Amino acid sequence: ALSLTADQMVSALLDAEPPILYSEYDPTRPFSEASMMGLLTNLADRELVHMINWAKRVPGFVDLTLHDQVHLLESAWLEILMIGLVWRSMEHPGKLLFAPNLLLDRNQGKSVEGMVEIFDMLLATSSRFRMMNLQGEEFVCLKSIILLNSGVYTFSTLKSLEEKDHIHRVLDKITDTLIHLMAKAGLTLQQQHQRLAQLLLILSHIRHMSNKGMEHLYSMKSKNVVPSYDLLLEMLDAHRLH
Amino acid sequence: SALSLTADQMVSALLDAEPPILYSEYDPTRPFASMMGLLTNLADRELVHMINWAKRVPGFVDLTLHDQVHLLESAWLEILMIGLVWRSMEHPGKLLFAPNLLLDRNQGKSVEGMVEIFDMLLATSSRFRMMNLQGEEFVCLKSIILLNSGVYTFKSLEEKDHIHRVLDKITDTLIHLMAKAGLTLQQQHQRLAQLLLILSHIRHMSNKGMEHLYSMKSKNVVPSYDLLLEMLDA
Ligand SMILES: O=C(c1ccc(OCCN2CCCCC2)cc1)c1c(-c2ccc(O)cc2)sc2cc(O)ccc12
Ligand SMILES: O=C(c1ccc(OCCN2CCCCC2)cc1)c1c(-c2ccc(O)cc2)sc2cc(O)ccc12
């Protein structure tokens, strides 16, 4: 993994991209605002399975222990859902494209108590992507950075010092990769550094939205909010029988 | 105008703007639970010095008062935390809230819900330590937190463009520092990225800290709009 070129890094990330899923309901029937959370929950749950298989294709990720793979996904899963949402919504001002058949605006967000504030933050992030003219190759680098970065500070065993050093090396490679993309695009050295910072600073906002969103989901008092250790392990820990 | 400062002038302005290190307010002859009262009192006194510092960050006072207040509302606990982490850098295993208030994680356990965030703060300090973070870099990072934390949640696009122009100059300033220190272009990029990724962790800690503070049902957690505006002293 640490021997990939920038071009190989981009290529592997582009190839790992998960599909765009649809909301599960009959589109010949009228839409009901009262079904919204149900629809969003079912969508998130199905997306999680594809997220696990995307994560396994992120260079350097399966080199980690399964325990650490689980912890990174525990920390990052809602951030990853959210940056994916923002990316899908970038070309639809004022809207959030949860699915091609589930395109919502903030007035619809208002029907769920406590949701509109987060809605508004997601919309502003989509606006920022648009203002920056964020490219696909840049987007997949950012999403991989979220996966590797978000949980790396909340995990001192010898094996684990080895894990953190590996993560930091892979992160350095993704930085090189972003710079390569920007250079190949024709940006000056000054413009490369400035845009690199602009991209990375957005990740602080994505982390903020993830924490506000998590607090919001917990406030709904559903039985199931986060993916369990066991659920994630089961999905991550495949046998070699297939 | 602020946008015309050189990288060297930006660094000097930020170093000179640095706030003082305050002490905890307690009688050291008296027996030492009341931990939260001490920390609350400390943070409350730190805030006015934070406002004086923000007014000295180049470009900040070119914003409307309304927008200055919004930025401080968003950033104040992050700023207190990166300050704590910086002060704690040479004290492995402990958090230097003040020179007369140096606590370890065992003392953090005495307050329900605190030790998890305590541990995150200690880890961030260790990361700064291992990166050999310099004072010149620290004051750039802290200025970035002030300008960046609220910029995605706001004439208004003129204000945002201004903020992003100032952020760009601080990026330029960070790179300049690293170049003078003899880092290669590759190392310059990589170090900039490593520093900015730590800011996501600091945002995370601020979020969890805020939840914790709210979970204690205290008199009040966030500084009000009116308090901040008053301290800005129009
Ligand atoms: O609405 C959701 C959402 C709903 C349920 C979720 O989790 C359901 C619990 N489930 C339990 C098993 C493990 C996986 C999660 C997650 C997101 C989405 C979001 C959200 C927005 C605002 C807010 O205040 C809270 C969340 S963002 C998002 C992106 C998606 O691709 C899908 C759903 C979503
Ligand atoms: O303990 C505090 C703290 C206590 C009270 C605070 O706010 C009190 C409310 N006050 C109201 C008027 C405006 C200012 C805030 C803020 C921080 C500090 C921190 C903390 C750590 C862990 C955790 O779970 C929660 C907080 S971090 C910190 C750094 C400081 O320089 C000072 C206090 C602190």
Numbering used by the authors:
A (entry chain A): 307 to 461, 464 to 550
B (entry chain B): 306 to 337, 340 to 461, 467 to 546
What does the publication say?
We also solved structures with the WT LBD for those molecules with no existing structures (LA-Deg, LA-Stab, RU39411) or were able to solve to improved resolution (RAL). For WT cells: GDC0927, RAL, and OP1074 showed the most potent transcriptional inhibition at IC50 = 0.03 ± 0.08, 0.11 ± 0.08, and 0.14 ± 0.05 nM respectively, compared to 0.35 ± 0.06 nM for fulvestrant. Overall, these structures present canonical ERα LBD homodimers with 2–4 monomers in the asymmetric unit.
The pro-oncogenic cellular activities of estrogen receptor alpha (ERα) drive breast cancer pathogenesis. Ligand-dependent transcriptional activities depend on the association of coactivator proteins with ERα to form functional complexes. SERMs and SERDs elicit a structural rearrangement of the ERα LBD to sterically preclude binding of coactivators in the activating function-2 cleft. Activating somatic mutations near ERα helix 12, Y537S and D538G, enable hormone therapy resistance in metastatic ER +breast cancers.
